Each structure stands twice: as C-alpha cells, then as structure tokens.
Symmetry: C3
Subunit: 26 residues, 3 copies
C-alpha cells in the first residue's frame, strides 16, 4: 500500500538522479 508508493518514488528519484549525472556529463 504505502510501500507501493515508497518504491515508485525511489524509481522516479533515481531517474531524476540519473538524468542529472548525465546532464552534468553532457
């Protein structure tokens, strides 16, 4: 329930975290 929500967030944050490293790279 909540945990579905937690886990969906660490996905979105990870991708945003990923896009940043890439953008800082690019």
């Amino acid at each position: 329930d909540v945990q579905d929500r937690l886990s969906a967030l660490e996905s979105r944050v990870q991708q945003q975290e990923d896009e940043m490293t890439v953008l800082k790279a690019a």
Copy 2:
C-alpha cells in the same frame, strides 16, 4: 501517525514531480 506517513508521502511525490518538470524544461531550454 499513518496520516503523517501519508502526508510525508504526498509532499514527496509533489516535490519530485515538480523536479521532474523542472528537469524537462531545462533539457528543453
């Protein structure tokens, strides 16, 4: 205290979406 988790949750999914949006705008700009 489940309301608090609920509240903390919803505030996080709000902040993250705004960042997600902030990101796409930059990638655009």
Copy 3:
C-alpha cells in the same frame, strides 16, 4: 515500520539534494 520511516527520510534527503543541484544549474 522503522524501515518505512527510514525510507522516508532517505528520500527527503535525496530530493533536497536533487533540488539543490538544480538551483545551482539554474544559475548557469
């Protein structure tokens, strides 16, 4: 349930750090 509390705080940390990284870039 602590894991739930722990997962929360680890997320609000990443997000603030993420927000901080952007404001730095919005400068450039």
